[PDB]
Amino acid sequence: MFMINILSLIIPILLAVAFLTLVERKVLGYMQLRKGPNVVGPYGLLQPIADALKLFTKEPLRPATSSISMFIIAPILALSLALTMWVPLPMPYPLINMNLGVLFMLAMSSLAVYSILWSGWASNSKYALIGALRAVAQTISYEVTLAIILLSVLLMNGSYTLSTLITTQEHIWMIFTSWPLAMMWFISTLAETNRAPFDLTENVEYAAGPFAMFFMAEYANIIMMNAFTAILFLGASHDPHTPELYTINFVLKTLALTITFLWIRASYPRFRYDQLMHLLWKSFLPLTLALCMWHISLPIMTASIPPQS
Amino acid sequence: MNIMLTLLTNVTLASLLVLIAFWLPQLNAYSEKTSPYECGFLPFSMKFFLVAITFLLFDLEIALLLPLPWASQTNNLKTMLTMALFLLILLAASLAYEWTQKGLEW
Amino acid sequence: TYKFVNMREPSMDMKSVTDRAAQTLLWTELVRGLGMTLSYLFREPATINYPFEKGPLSPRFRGEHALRRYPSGEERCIACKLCEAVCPAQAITIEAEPRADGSRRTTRYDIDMTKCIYCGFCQEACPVDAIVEGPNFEFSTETHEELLYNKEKLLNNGDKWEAEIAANIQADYLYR
Amino acid sequence: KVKQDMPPPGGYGPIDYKRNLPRRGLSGYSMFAVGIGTLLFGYW
Amino acid sequence: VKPIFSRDMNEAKRRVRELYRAWYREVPNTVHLFQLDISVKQGRDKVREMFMKNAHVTDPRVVDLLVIKGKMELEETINVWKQRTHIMRFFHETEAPRPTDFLSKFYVGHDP
Amino acid sequence: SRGEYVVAKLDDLVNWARRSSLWPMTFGLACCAVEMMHMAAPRYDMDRFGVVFRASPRQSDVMIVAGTLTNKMAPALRKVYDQMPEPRYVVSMGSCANGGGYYHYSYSVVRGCDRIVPVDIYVPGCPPTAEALLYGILQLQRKIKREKRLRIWYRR
Ligand code: SF4
């Protein structure tokens, strides 16, 4: 039965990513006074299937990989880590309940970075390596601020247990207590997934299937990060007898956050590498440090230290 | 065993998909692109490495800052608060040093 | 006569500085832009349902060239060849011989649409309204040879589209 | 009689030709106060 | 008349030799850079052939301009501004050889 | 037979996927690129048909030659074309791309992109109206729909 749970966590997420592609297309189009995919299936519901079938039939070209071995491991690592990050998330009950689930999430995101380095290095392409290293630099800065914000917000949770966040936000959403950290956290999540305006347009050598899987892993990471934001700040009511209510509310929150991800994508011009790092090092980092000081001092000075257990 | 099972299932699923995406789709015959990778022949700028070493050190300081949630339960709250503020001040000082001096060039 | 874009000094009033810092810290202008795109989301999309819905077009539209006929059924083209001369891309090739009756009827009226620029000089030059660019813009082919239109192809195009071509000319000849 | 496409008697109506970007939002003091108030309620 | 670069033919020949040295030394690299299928000898043979094509010139001004044009082609070749086809264009390959015998030309066509 | 029925149905499925999710690359060279943009503009919205402008030629299926292919640009077009993965289709937009159009007798204009790359659909016009280009793409979709790659392999 546990294997059934694993499958019921993996397969639906992949299907959700597939339909998220269509949702993004339509949302961006209608924000551009356009109709997204509307011919391929009713309201484009068959568009993701068409895309997948076309991709898995397109001639895969070989990118002269210096190390097929590594070139193949990078997609596997990305997808596997993306799937694993969903496991600790409490939709009211988590699949695997870890006392330190938050740190597990952070570590999984940290390993995911290697997929980028491995892809570029094995690609045997100067432009590929340059772009990969730029991605390394971008994810480098997000991790620091992300970790600091997560620690600061969990200073009121009482532990790194993800399930406890529901109890902490039972009465009031965490955002009302830590809204600046929420802003920086959302922007940091955008930076992590390289979603605009933190893209670096112009791992492209990947052909068809490989590319498709990398794309799936990236979008699954988008959905997972939005879910993490939901659980952290947008707490949801959980009735122990009827968990479906929490599941519905949480899903709606995650969908809203992904829609905001697309909404930002088609609202702002893309940053520049210098500007992105002069944000994530000279604007966010000092403020994150100050807010971490504040969120350490506040529970002590207000006698609001959360329970350890 | 449950977490190990999850890891195994995820890894195997990803590897199976990589199989059906790297070897299955290339079975279909698509002629032959007799096209050689014409190559005929180094930007090791500090601008990149600096971003890396500084991240390593800040990540190290972040590691020292991780046990803070459990450290708030100590009876010696004043001492713990002072030490935590000290570590945060040192992080800020390191950032300030790099910013004030020739650093944060990214 | 001249307007100074930008060239606006910022007031250093503490209230003004406070609002500027509020814009910087609270990301107000980004939220304003985001709201603008959200407003665009709830508008009505401007996409037409091709090919079930066609875009607006005027009677003066220039498209597929077509050779017309008099109401009696005789080809209007009297082989003056001035449309061949005026053609800025030298796309029209006209060869004429006295017909069995004795009129100036072309034995070759070839226009390669792959070289024509669809300027419309040909229809403006023709003194008998024989060569008139039709309303059909959807005549894409799969082979290059098809684009090169013979005299027979032009006559058939004229016979097919004559109703619309005549209606458009009747609706525009006064302007010309 | 001549029937060219001509301006209507009296001409067309006025056409906006200047930037209309309006002013929206509270004052900086007020916005900061609202944020701090939300923070205070959250803290309590 | 103002000389372009060389006042005398001897000065012009000096420029010609300088250009020939540069082309002669560049040919090996060019074959490597564009991955040409010609041999280093073939490229150097072509260079000599091209120089010998304009071997009837007697005006230093014309020789100067020829050297300038030769330099420009070398600059593009060295800077990889030319492409592989551009370098191969010197070696006319697809073009069918046109015969010189009168009887052959008589058969081929009305060629004068 | 049953074998033919299975192969035919599978071939139709493959044909549907490619024609539904055609990914074109904008090889915008001249005036015709502007009308191509108007095709992707809200009024016509090629994306509505699943045709999304793929900047990467390595992930493209249709090369829309839009403009005058000059001799200087000619090698680049072919080199980009052979770096496209298969199946790859070429759509020639505009008289200049079709047979040189206004510049057919120019000293530095290729007399049609057909010489450099094999073309599947020729869109006439100067510039062809965005609907005509959209019509050509739909004609290409129908052309893909008629393709029977698997059937011929089975009947070989
Ligand atoms: S201008 Fe008119 S009448 Fe004269 S040759 Fe052309 S089509 Fe015929």
Ligand code: SF4
């Ligand atoms: S419309 Fe223009 S390009 Fe076409 S045949 Fe007439 S003159 Fe030539």
Ligand code: SF4
């Ligand atoms: S066909 Fe006409 S519009 Fe298109 S590139 Fe040529 S001249 Fe420009």
